[PDB]
Write a protein that holds these residues in place. Structure first.
Motif, mmCIF file in Angstrom:
data_model
loop_
_atom_site.group_PDB
_atom_site.id
_atom_site.type_symbol
_atom_site.label_atom_id
_atom_site.label_comp_id
_atom_site.label_asym_id
_atom_site.label_seq_id
_atom_site.Cartn_x
_atom_site.Cartn_y
_atom_site.Cartn_z
ATOM 1 N N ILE A 19 0.815 -1.205 0.000
ATOM 2 C CA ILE A 19 0.000 0.000 0.000
ATOM 3 C C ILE A 19 0.864 1.277 0.000
ATOM 4 O O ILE A 19 0.620 2.214 -0.781
ATOM 5 C CB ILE A 19 -0.995 -0.013 1.186
ATOM 6 C CG1 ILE A 19 -2.076 -1.079 0.963
ATOM 7 C CG2 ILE A 19 -1.627 1.386 1.406
ATOM 8 C CD1 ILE A 19 -2.826 -1.504 2.254
ATOM 9 N N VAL A 48 -6.907 5.369 3.390
ATOM 10 C CA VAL A 48 -6.234 5.692 2.140
ATOM 11 C C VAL A 48 -7.086 6.650 1.317
ATOM 12 O O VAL A 48 -6.549 7.607 0.754
ATOM 13 C CB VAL A 48 -5.798 4.415 1.321
ATOM 14 C CG1 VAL A 48 -5.257 4.813 -0.094
ATOM 15 C CG2 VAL A 48 -4.695 3.626 2.093
ATOM 16 N N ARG A 70 -3.802 4.817 -8.012
ATOM 17 C CA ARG A 70 -3.528 4.062 -6.788
ATOM 18 C C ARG A 70 -3.817 2.598 -6.981
ATOM 19 O O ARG A 70 -2.985 1.770 -6.645
ATOM 20 C CB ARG A 70 -4.354 4.580 -5.607
ATOM 21 C CG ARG A 70 -4.143 3.768 -4.314
ATOM 22 C CD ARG A 70 -5.323 3.833 -3.364
ATOM 23 N NE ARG A 70 -6.524 3.344 -4.029
ATOM 24 C CZ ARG A 70 -6.879 2.063 -4.202
ATOM 25 N NH1 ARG A 70 -6.153 1.067 -3.748
ATOM 26 N NH2 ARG A 70 -8.004 1.778 -4.863
ATOM 27 N N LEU A 74 -0.934 -0.252 -6.942
ATOM 28 C CA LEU A 74 -1.053 -1.245 -5.880
ATOM 29 C C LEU A 74 -0.962 -2.653 -6.490
ATOM 30 O O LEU A 74 -0.243 -3.517 -5.978
ATOM 31 C CB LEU A 74 -2.370 -1.074 -5.143
ATOM 32 C CG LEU A 74 -2.514 -1.971 -3.928
ATOM 33 C CD1 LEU A 74 -1.381 -1.689 -2.939
ATOM 34 C CD2 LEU A 74 -3.867 -1.701 -3.338
#
Ligand SMILES: [Cl-]
Ligand SMILES: [Cl-]
Ligand SMILES: [Cl-]
Ligand SMILES: [Cl-]
Ligand SMILES: [Cl-]
Ligand SMILES: [Mg+2]
Length: 204
Positions: A19, A48, A70, A74
């Motif tokens: 993460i 997040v 993101r 990830l």
């Protein structure tokens, strides 16, 4: 008889570094300064998504674009995902015991990839992710679906997690809860380690 419905992060999966790496990559793309410790403390106090929101508001960026970068980044860090301690052992124990096993996670389809990478995907009869269509925990609908489909017994069905919202999900859906946290919910069973789970199912 018995069914476990599992959380991933902080329960089965240790995605912490993946993460953070994902966020670092996302921050590099948008030219956002990255301090690991400050990011660490923020995502522990908040989430997040709140971090994306904060930098979107503060730096005039589009939060949905942030979130898509993101998710993408990830998915490139799957190699950094590690099982939580005791996770392989409890999964194998449950399987041997004839406990039917399910997942409901806020992660996306990449959850399948991770579980396959870690060699644990085959334990699960059905894996429900954010692509499932269901409202996020603690909304009960995902659990109600599994009860209805698999004919599960609400007294012998446990959502296993690490956060308050995981206990709420169980409570909202009428099922039992196994959780690292204490709760006033009567159907919660607090554990100190994954190894404690098997002890629930034997005399004391
Ligand atoms: Cl998760
Ligand atoms: Cl994340
Ligand atoms: Cl597998
Ligand atoms: Cl939702
Ligand atoms: Cl969720
Ligand atoms: Mg969790």
């Amino acid at each position: 008889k018995t069914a476990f419905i599992w959380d991933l992060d902080g329960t089965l999966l240790d995605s912490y570094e993946a993460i953070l790496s994902g966020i670092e990559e996302t921050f590099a793309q948008f030219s956002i300064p990255y301090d690991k410790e400050k990011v660490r403390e923020f995502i522990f106090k908040y989430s997040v998504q709140d971090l994306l929101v904060r930098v979107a508001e503060d730096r005039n960026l589009d939060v949905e674009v942030l979130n898509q970068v993101r998710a993408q980044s990830l998915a490139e860090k799957n190699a950094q995902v590690v099982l939580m301690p005791g996770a392989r052992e409890v999964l194998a124990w449950a399987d041997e015991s004839g406990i039917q096993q399910f997942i409901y996670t806020h992660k996306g389809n990449n959850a399948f990839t991770i579980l396959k990478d870690l060699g644990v995907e085959s334990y699960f009869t059905e894996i429900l992710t954010s692509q499932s269509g269901f409202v996020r925990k603690p909304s009960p609908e995902a659990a109600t679906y599994l009860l209805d489909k698999y004919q599960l017994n609400s007294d012998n069905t446990y959502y296993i997690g690490d956060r308050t919202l995981d206990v709420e999900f169980a409570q909202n859906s009428g099922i039992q809860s196994i959780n690292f946290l204490e709760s006033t919910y009567e159907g919660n069973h607090r554990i100190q380690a994954l190894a404690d789970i098997s002890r629930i199912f034997e005399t004391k």
